[PDB]
Amino acid sequence: DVTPRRDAEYPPPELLEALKPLHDICAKKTGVTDEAIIEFSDGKIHEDEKLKCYMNCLFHEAKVVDDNGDVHLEKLRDSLPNSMHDIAMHMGKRCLYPEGENLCEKAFWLHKCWKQADPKHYFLV
Numbered sequence: 001d002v003t004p005r006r007d008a009e010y011p012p013p014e015l016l017e018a019l020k021p022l023h024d025i026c027a028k029k030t031g032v033t034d035e036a037i038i039e040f041s042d043g044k045i046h047e048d049e050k051l052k053c054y055m056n057c058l059f060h061e062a063k064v065v066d067d068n069g070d071v072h073l074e075k076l077r078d079s080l081p082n083s084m085h086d087i088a089m090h091m092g093k094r095c096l097y098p099e100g101e102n103l104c105e106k107a108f109w110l111h112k113c114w115k116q117a118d119p120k121h122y123f124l125v
Helices: 013-030 034-041 049-061 073-079 082-091 103-117
Strands: none
Touching: 013 034, 013 049, 034 049, 049 103, 073 082, 082 103
């Protein structure tokens, strides 16, 4: 029911400009297409095997995992500022249980979980 939102008030225009590129990087790496990426953000949650890899590709890119993609939760927190940190703790009220078989499937679990958690603060990632 709730519709996605994002402007120059919640999402910082600075980290936003740095995201697009970072996104273009992993994307071009996963071979995926903005369409798939967008459809996932503006559209709805689709199951594009690539989008899943594109996500996993992000984890590694941002270098926030160990040596296999275990996604260090301790490092993930120390990464985002106290702002996203608080919003990250709120969403945690739904995920925290990667159900897949590999980084790709897992990376997706969280996203699909971080999206259904509260469809209003989610944007590109």
